[PDB]
Amino acid sequence: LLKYNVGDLVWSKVSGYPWWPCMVSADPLLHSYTKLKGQKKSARQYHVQFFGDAPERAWIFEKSLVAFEGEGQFEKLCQESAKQAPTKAEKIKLLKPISGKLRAQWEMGIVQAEEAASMSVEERKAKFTFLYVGDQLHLNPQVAKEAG
Ligand SMILES: Cc1ccc(CNc2cccnc2)cc1-c1ncn(C)c1-c1ccc2c(c1)OCC(=O)N2
Numbered sequence: 001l002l003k004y005n006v007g008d009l010v011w012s013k014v015s016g017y018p019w020w021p022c023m024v025s026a027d028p029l030l031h032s033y034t035k036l037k038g039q040k041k042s043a044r045q046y047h048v049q050f051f052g053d054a055p056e057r058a059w060i061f062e063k064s065l066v067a068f069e070g071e072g073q074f075e076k077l078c079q080e081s082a083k084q085a086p087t088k089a090e091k092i093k094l095l096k097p098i099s100g101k102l103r104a105q106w107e108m109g110i111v112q113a114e115e116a117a118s119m120s121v122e123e124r125k126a127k128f129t130f131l132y133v134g135d136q137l138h139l140n141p142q143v144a145k146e147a148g
Pocket residue numbers: 014017018020050051052053054055056057058102105106109
């Protein structure tokens with residue numbers, strides 16, 4: 001009984017980054033969207049696409065994944081992550097708003113994620129699945145036009 005499937009939108013928490021809007025996808029080289037690290041039933045990973053103008057992808061642990069509904073969760077997500085922080089300096093970083101190129105990318109990515117939430121699982125897959133040509137990770141030309 002998998003929690004997520006190709007197309008499902010999720011918030012991903014990576015260490016050293018804020019919570020990010022994502023979408024579960026099939027790995028272009030491995031062809032899988034979920035794995036078990038070291039065959040440990042607990043350590044399940046999901047291949048996700050990170051919403052934004054400078055796109056990325058990664059195998060994220062399921063324990064670091066929250067179902068995405070909208071940007072309204074972001075604040076409550078930062079509050080929980082700040083509750084289990086090891087220092088006051090860690091709690092400040094998590095509660096401090098995103099800035100610089102990361103902020104501009106996060107907001108642009110929030111636009112695509114919320115746009116995809118209002119679509120069918122196949123409509124959002126067709127619109128926001130990345131296109132890959134060799135080692136090149138490309139955005140869908142319509143998505144690239146909407147970003148810049
Ligand atoms: C998976 C991932 C891969 C690579 C890198 C390094 N990127 C990079 C690129 C060029 C120069 N310097 C650094 C980061 C990450 C990553 N890990 C966790 N998070 C939250 C990210 C991440 C951060 C920002 C964006 C993103 C993913 O995807 C879309 C986007 O527009 N912005």
